[PDB]
Design a protein around this ligand. Structure first.
Ligand code: FAD
Ligand code: FAD
Ligand code: PL3
Ligand code: PL3
Lengths: 523, 523
């Protein structure tokens, strides 16, 4: 047995066996993966050179060179844990502790990379079942011990990081509770241990003919319980609904008892989005759907960002909407084509041909997907394609199943490579009305570029649209520079374009009732 | 100015100017409406004779002057403070005012008001004009320790507005003068709406601005937005427009400890479905939709209930669903045709039942709304499934009128109560597996328990909602007056076929925190 915390990078993203690196002789960048031989990416080096000027090397510290204060001691608590849990279910070695300290924001990565580990948990517990979680929480309440559940640790808001250090603190790693317990194909529901990781969930559901359909960009390295405790957004939500809609019921172990769910109050909304501050979700009954009989993904190009946005609007107004759509601005478009694996070219050829008639400085890629019954897919496809025709979309063709849409999963791998070579990249996500969209998009990019160009520093910024609403979009900025304010600059300008409480007392009452001792992820 | 409570029947349903009545000496039953007087329904007398055996015995309700209501309690300091802020026309404590703010519209309610049994009246009715006036009232009620119970249409059937005890001075806050749409945002597709607005008034005001809400409970005509919110009522176009909680973007709620405003935890769900126990909703921002370009409603006949249910199942599995569907069992089908003042529908049904025994034939009404292209796609998909299940087409008729006859049914209850009869309902969710046997067994058990006694009884059902593995089955059962003997019998057989709490302590802390003195609809 290797635990997930050992298989996922302790100072970067995702699988330890998957990473970008440079190949001899010429410094070609290549993607190593566990299943496939290293795949060269011939254009990527040239792209990084163009946009941001040998690559300077800035390796992270090795784990033996990282100092972590010894764990606190709580002999009597630990004794009671020892009497119930197996030895392999309790860890306090350095690796264990570091990996249960940090999420995956840039702030986390920077800090772990330079060895700044100021508030590790004292102990990691890996329970096997709901009944073991109940015992652990019983004991944590009895002894006044802080508990912080962790799934993938992919959050970017510091949600798993211990805040204080007065009490003994335990990280409850949920990832050994990773079984689909049953699938009811008549109710179309599945009961699922929430420590399960995205691709493991989908693989186990597929075996029974079903799927969940929740697809955040962190799909590969985040868990069902994490999705539920954060209310994360998914990129097939137009078809399958938001996570809160997919959640029929779930069990929550709290300091004051297990809370069970089945015109009055709908109590699931008290726990969804609570970030481990109100107890530990253990098992969830989720709404599933039959594996779709038709799955079709298509790429398109638009002469400008304005044409794409226009199609986005018209598609939404026609009321016949794709399962997934994403629109890439010209910079993210160029990055998408610069990332063309020579191993493992037809659409790269269509893009090169297109950019002879239309300026590449302006060309946007769109990826559009459809799933469902053949008849439904056919109707939706034909409806959207007709709207695409009216907005000067140029078709790049299909490719086959879902893999046009699983290339967003590779992006965080690029961040690690950048961090290793004197660069950083960060993101800002905003909702913005169509009225302000093209003006904020243009102004944010020009402002950010010029602020670094005016100091003699290279800097690059792209954007994509991932979600559309009645009167707006979700706009996602990615911005990169060289290692030496930039967050504040993007934030100020987002606010300057309309881009995105007695309830405190209601929450306080819930929290004091549910968690009298404030042991649950105290904030 | 006439208040809504003066325009709605104080001892029956709906508009004081609309009712069924018996013409004399002919005995023909007729329907009066404020637009046309005494429209004969030539088949309805014969239907009533057939099913429940010809002179109708008369059982008139008591006149209001013959009804005793204990005088209001007095609370001079409280009332003095109210009198300083509220206009005299806003405060009522006459008998009519007290009676119409005591009872809902359940059978138990109607029975009690009709024999003059008024045990628990509020002491005062307050009709506020604005959010700011509700805030003052709730402040004053908390200061003086005065129970407050908000009311909309008073259409609920669970005793939700009926004062429970008489220790404290009790006020009914009639929301119905707060009945304006305050704005419509047609780019966002939201409207801000004072929640005392009645259903048809809401849709009329929204239509003026090119939008619609689409929430449609069977009580639509005489219930309010605030009632829908505070009860999470179900609506019969929800497959298309979503549930009331999905339509609710935000709202303001005035509580004994402050006004709770809405834009982690999604707090709206603490208040939706709270039945006035956690404060008073005053204004809501609701999701609206453009008035649809196509609205098409069709009728179909099926040779048996089993065929109809089959079509229901296969329609849902096809994933292409109508806006509204209802399936009427053979007894409710017969009632629907016997309720005839369209004449072409009767003609087709009469012809069909020459080929198929009428004792088995079920009517279905199926509607589609949306963009023409969407309506066309859904119509043609559903029509073809309907072919596979022996559905016979009755045609259309024009707009939504096929679908607004359900609004007239409670008017029939009043007429029955005036003629030595009663009628009640039980709704249940039930799996497709148990559906047909619960349907057959409930109907048969119910008639036999009365026929064994030498007493007429009639029972029908319809299906109003379908789910993945089930339906919502609605029973309507009627007999002669001589409720609790036959309701229990139904209640038991539903419980038989699988027909449709540490959270209590969560609720208690919310309620103790929000409403320390327990003035909000104390239970
Ligand atoms: C590259 C990248 C892409 C991302 N893309 C998206 C995206 O598209 N949409 C989106 O919303 N987010 C996205 N995120 C953020 C993040 O992945 C999501 O919030 C995700 O839901 C976190 O899941 P997790 O299993 O990693 O939770 P963790 O990081 O382990 O925990 C998050 C919170 O949930 C709590 N928690 C975990 N398990 C439980 C449990 N069983 N019971 C109670 N509380 C629990 C933790 O205490 C913590 O407060 C992204 C992050 C990265 C780094
Ligand atoms: C013939 C008939 C058909 C029906 N059909 C349906 C149906 O299809 N679907 C369904 O769900 N129900 C149905 N019902 C029940 C009922 O009409 C609904 O529950 C409706 O939502 C109640 O609305 P109302 O305005 O009359 O509320 P009321 O009866 O006035 O009040 C109901 C509850 O909500 C509270 N309330 C009212 N206003 C506020 C406010 N502003 N703030 C806080 N609390 C408030 C009251 O205190 C009470 O607790 C039906 C009832 C009848 C008689
Ligand atoms: C500098 C030119 C090369 C382009 C840089 C590639 C962009 C890398 C995107 C990585 C995004 C990972 C961040 C996830 C969001 C959470 O913090
Ligand atoms: C023999 C003809 C019978 C006519 C049937 C009329 C159905 C009347 C429906 C009454 C609506 C009742 C809903 C509230 C329930 C109260 O307890």
């Amino acid at each position: 047995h290797i635990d997930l915390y050992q298989q996922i990078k302790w100072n970067g993203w995702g699988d330890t066996r998957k990473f970008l690196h440079q190949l001899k002789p010429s410094g070609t960048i290549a993607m190593t993966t566990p299943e496939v031989s290293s795949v060269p990416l011939p254009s990527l080096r040239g792209f990084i050179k163009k946009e941001l000027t040998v690559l300077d090397e800035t390796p992270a510290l090795q784990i033996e060179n990282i100092h972590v204060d010894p764990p606190k001691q709580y002999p009597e608590f630990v004794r009671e844990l020892k009497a119930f849990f197996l030895p392999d279910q309790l860890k306090d070695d350095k690796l264990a502790r570091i990996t249960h300290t940090f999420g995956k924001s840039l702030r986390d990565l920077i800090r772990v990379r330079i060895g700044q580990v100021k508030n590790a948990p004292d102990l990691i517990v890996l329970p096997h079942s709901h009944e073991e979680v109940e015992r652990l929480v019983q004991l944590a309440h009895k002894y006044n011990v802080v508990i912080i559940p962790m799934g993938g640790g992919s959050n970017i808001v510091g949600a798993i990081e211990p805040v204080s250090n007065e009490r003994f603190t335990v990280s409850i790693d949920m990832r050994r509770m990773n079984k689909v317990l049953w699938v009811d194909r008549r109710e179309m529901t599945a009961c699922i241990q929430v420590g399960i990781m995205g691709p493991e969930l989908e693989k186990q559901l597929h075996k029974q003919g079903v799927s969940l359909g929740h697809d955040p960009d962190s799909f590969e390295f985040s868990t069902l319980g994490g999705w539920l405790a954060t209310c994360s957004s998914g990129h097939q939500s137009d078809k399958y609904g938001d996570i809160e809609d997919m959640a029929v019921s779930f069990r929550t172990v709290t300091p004051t008892g297990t809370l069970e769910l089945r015109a009055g109050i709908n109590y699931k909304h008290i726990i969804l989005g609570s970030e481990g501050t109100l107890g530990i979700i253990t098992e969830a009954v989720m709404k599933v759907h039959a594996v779709p009989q038709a799955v079709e993904y298509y790429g398109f190009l638009f002469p400008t960002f304005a044409h794409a946005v226009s199609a986005l609007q018209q598609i939404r107004s026609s009321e016949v909407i794709p399962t997934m759509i994403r629109v890439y601005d010209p910079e993210e478009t160029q990055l998408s084509f610069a990332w063309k694996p020579s191993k493992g070219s037809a659409m790269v050829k269509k893009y090169l041909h297109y950019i002879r008639s239309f300026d590449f400085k302006n060309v946007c890629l769109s990826i559009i997907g459809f799933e469902g019954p053949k008849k439904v897919v056919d109707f939706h496809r034909t409806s959207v394609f007709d709207i695409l025709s009216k907005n000067a979309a140029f078709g790049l063709g299909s490719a086959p199943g879902k893999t046009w849409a699983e290339k967003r999963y590779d992006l965080p791998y690029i961040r690690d490579f950048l961090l290793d070579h004197n660069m950083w990249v960060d993101v800002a996500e905003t909702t913005v009305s169509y009225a302000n969209l093209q003006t904020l998009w243009k102004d944010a990019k020009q402002t950010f570029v010029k602020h670094f160009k005016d100091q003699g520093i290279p800097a690059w910024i792209c954007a994509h649209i991932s979600h559309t609403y009645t009167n707006g979009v979700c706009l996602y900025f990615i911005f990169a520079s060289k290692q030496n304010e930039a967050k504040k600059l993007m934030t100020d300008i987002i606010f300057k374009y309309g881009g995105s409480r007695g309830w405190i007392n209601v929450y306080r009452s819930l929290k004091e009732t549910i968690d009298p001792k404030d042991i649950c992820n105290p904030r």
